[PDB]
Amino acid sequence: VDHYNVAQDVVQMLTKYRELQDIIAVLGIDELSEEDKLIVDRARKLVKFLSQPFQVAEVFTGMTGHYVQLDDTIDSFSGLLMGTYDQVPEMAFYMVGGINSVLEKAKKMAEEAAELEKMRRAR
Amino acid sequence: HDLPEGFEFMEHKVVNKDIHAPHENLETLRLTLTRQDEFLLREEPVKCVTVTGTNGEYGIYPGHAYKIVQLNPSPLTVEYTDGTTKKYFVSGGFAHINNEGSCDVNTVECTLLDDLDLAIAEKELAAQQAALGSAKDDKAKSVVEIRISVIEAVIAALKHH
Amino acid sequence: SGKLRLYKEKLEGYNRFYSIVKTIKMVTLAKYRAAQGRIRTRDFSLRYTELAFSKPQASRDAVVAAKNALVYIPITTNRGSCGALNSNIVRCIDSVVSSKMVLMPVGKRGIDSFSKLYPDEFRYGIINDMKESMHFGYATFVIENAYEVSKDADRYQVIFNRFVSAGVQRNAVYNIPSYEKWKEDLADAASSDNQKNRYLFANALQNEEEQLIRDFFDFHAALAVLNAVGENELSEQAARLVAVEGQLTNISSLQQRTSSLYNKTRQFGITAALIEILSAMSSLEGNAMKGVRRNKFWEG
Amino acid sequence: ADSVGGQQVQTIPMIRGARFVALFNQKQPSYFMNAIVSLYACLNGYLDDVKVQYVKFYEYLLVHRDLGIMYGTAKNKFFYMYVQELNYLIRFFTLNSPILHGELEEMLKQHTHLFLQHYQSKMNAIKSEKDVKALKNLLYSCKRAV
Ligand SMILES: O=c1ccn([C@@H]2O[C@H](COP(=O)(O)OP(=O)(O)OP(=O)(O)O)[C@@H](O)[C@H]2O)c(=O)[nH]1
Structure with a gap:
């Protein structure tokens, strides 16, 4: 039941995000309501979180592939839908495996950003 | 390229009486x-x-x-x-x-x-009075005293009738 | 077929571009009718402000002798789609450009447009969120910043839009001379027969103390700014409603041009596919050859 | 169409259209009595105080449960949703008839009052990590249960 419910929620959110995209295109992101932008921000993470590096496309991508278990996928998407990872940066979901890889990439993103800030600070 | 002055669109001017x-x-x-x-x-x-x-x-x-x-x-x-x-x-x-x-x-x-409202006016004076006691600097005290003067005038105005 | 559906997808986007724009028309027809209350309650606050500052002077002598900085404060809208208001204001400002010109534009579009175009004259701009009503405090913020930009300024000029009617939005100018030049003119209007209409007003100010005069000058200057921004907002909403009509018609013309190409394409597609099939049918008929007829021809 | 952007204002036509557009979701066919009764309740405004998310749960309780009997408050003599043979009486006599109109309104009013008092009140008070999930699962199950 959890698998079925999660999948339907993902599909509905993606469908709604596409409709909101027209409004973002015409009116702009500013004019969207509080609820709409939360859908936008969550949906974009879903779009990037669906991507996955395959073990056979290492030459094309240049990164090691991942094998995500069925349970890990369901739990990761379930938490994302209800906003458990709203504070995680968007790009942390791009070309990764399970939720654990997302957190590691976010940590790496934070570290490099801190280094850039330190370099700017010295300047 | 001369632009109209914003007062040209106003049709109710002030009539002054010639002294003579x-x-x-x-x-x-x-x-x-x-x-x-x-x-x-x-x-x-x-x-x-x-x-x-x-x-x-x-x-x-x-x-x-x-x-x-x-x-x-x-x-x-x-x-x-x-x-x-x-x-x-x-x-x-x-x-x-x-x-x-x-x-x-x-x-x-x-x-x-x-x-x-007189009830609102009274409680507001009390709050600003406490700030005036703890008002950090001379400028802050002056601003607080401006509020009190208005509030007391309002309170006195309503108490009159 | 993809080609046919390419037009259908294109028209699908056009068909909803209209809905989003139509909702915007409704949004901007609420705020136009909400701000229509000013139409009733205007044209009376600025009566003695006219006497204070109304001086129909020449447009050359007032800018040729720019001994000190001239601080222009054009009024511009935060959001685009308003129309030609901002463009005209820029033309009005470009026409006054001077060595002694300092700009303190209002609105995000004003800042962005005047920052790029005149980059050594722009100083900084004021931005107001269109959340509350245009009040006195905002005007006082405009004036205080204007003075700090150039305290030793020959004149502070506000260039805004006057909403004459639903379809008429002209450009208006409030010119505020600094204290020194104003009190000098106020002194001449009092003593001399020149400026008769201001004689009584000027003498009634010279009788009072100076601080009162300075407060009077600042107060009426704020009112002029308040009127300009208030009018510029009403012109903005009125203009947007008109512009958001022009977009509707442009998006309707496209819908009538992409529909024809969609209906012209389906007709051609049906004809060509049918022609292909018949060509193959004729080719297979032509290649076919009838054999000798094995019938009793003699018994005929 | 005008609502999408501009902060839709919830007039009574909108307050009832949303419920109608959320009673239409279903997986299995609905018995005539259950469907007609639910539509009538939403038509007369009995669901105006019910949030759109809980409409399916409200319908499920109305059909497969009886709040009045649960709390010992039902006063109707024959009109109960567990009497599946009322369908043909409703077909012969419209809901807007004195034979059935009086008891129908009484049951709907009582069911609506009990639901708001007991269930929706608890739903709006859910603050936890597991209760929220349980509520979400319950709503989804009711969505495809009636
Ligand atoms: O030492 C002085 C002398 C005069 N003044 C000010 O000069 C002005 C002269 O004002 P007027 O001479 O025109 O009239 P007034 O005495 O009736 O004035 P009011 O009290 O009715 O307002 C008044 O506003 C007075 O306060 C001072 O403030 N200080």
Whole structure:
């Protein structure tokens, strides 16, 4: 039941995000309501979180592939839908495996950003 | 390429009486009470108007001499020829009195004294009084004292009637 | 077919571009009717402000002798789609450019447009969120910043839009001379027969104390700014409603041009496919050859 | 169409259209009595105080449960949703008939009052990590249960 419910929620959110995209295109992101932008921000993470590096496309991508278990996928998407990872940066979901890889990439993103800030600070 | 001045679109100018002219006996004062570019009263005939300027209170009747008054936070009274009274409260501004029989009272804020609440006015004074005791610096104390003066004027204005 | 559906997708986007724009028309027809209250309650606050500052002077002598900085404060809208208001204001400002010109534009579009175009004259701009009503405090913020930009300024000029009617939005200018030049003119209007209409007004100010005069000058200057921004907002909403009509018609013309190409394409597609099939049918008929007829021809 | 952007204002036509557009979701066919009764309740405004998310749960309780009997408050003599043979009586006699109109309104009013008092009140008070999930699962199950 959890698998079925999660999948339907993902599909509905993606469908709604596409409709909101027209409004973002015409009116702009500013004019969207509080609820709409939360859908936008969550949906974009879903779009990037669906991507996955395959073990056979290492030459094309240049990164090691991942094998995500069925349970890990369901739990990761379930938490994302209800906003458990709203504070995680968007790009942390791009070309990764399970939720654990997302957190590691976010940590790496934070570290490099801190280094850039330190370099700017010295300047 | 010459541009119009913004006053050309305004069709209600001020009429000044030439000094070398005969006098007229006037029984009505044309009042224009204005707030934030909005007239609450417009060329409205009133018997008298009472205004509180920095020096003191002025009772303006028709034919009053040309004068400019810098108002202070205080009540303003408008009495019609019916003898009926309408009382507002102003926070500041200016009053221009013309010898032709007109009075244009432009205020930053002009609210009917009914709208103001005495219970709210009293508690607010108490809060600012505590801040004045703990007010960090001289400037902060001066600002707080400005609020208290307005509040006490409001409280005193409502207690009068 | 993809080609046919390419037009259908294109028209699908056009068909909803209209809905989003139509909702915007409704949004901007609420705020136009909400701000229509000013139409009733205007044209009376600025009566003695006219006497203070109304001086129909020449447009050359007032800018040729720019001994000190001239601080222009054009009024511009935060959001685009307003129309030609901002463009005209820029033309009005470009026409006054001087060595002694300092710009303190209002609105995000004003800042962005005037920052790029005149980059050594722009100083900084004021931005107001269109959340509350245009009040005195905002005007006082405009004036205070204007003075700090150039305290030793020959004149502070506000260039805004006057809403004459629903379809007429002209450009208006409030010019505020600094204290020194104003009190000098106020002194001449009092003593001399020149400026008769201001004689009584000027003498009624000279009688009072100076601080009162300075407060009077600042107060009426704020009112002029308040009127300009208030009018510029009403012109903005009125203009947007008109512009958001022009977009509707442009998006309707496209819908009538992409529909024809869609209906012209389906007709051609049906004809060509049918022609292909018949060509193959004729080819297979032509290649076919009838054999000798094995019938009793003699017994006829 | 005008609502999408501009902060839709919830007039009574909108307050009832949303419920109608959320009673239309279903997986299995609905018995005539259950469907007609639910539509009538939403038509007369009995669901105006019910949030759109809980409409399916409200319908499920109305059909497969009886709040009045649960709390010992039902006063109707024959009109109960567990009497599946009322369908043909409703077909012969419209809901807007004195034979059935009086009891129908009484049951709907009682069911609506009990639901708001007991269930929706608890739903709006859910603050936890597991209760929220349980509520979400319950709503989804009711969505495809009636
Ligand atoms: O030492 C002085 C002398 C005069 N003044 C100011 O000069 C002005 C002269 O004002 P007027 O001479 O024109 O009239 P007035 O005495 O009736 O004035 P009010 O009290 O009715 O307002 C008044 O506003 C007075 O306060 C001072 O402030 N200080």
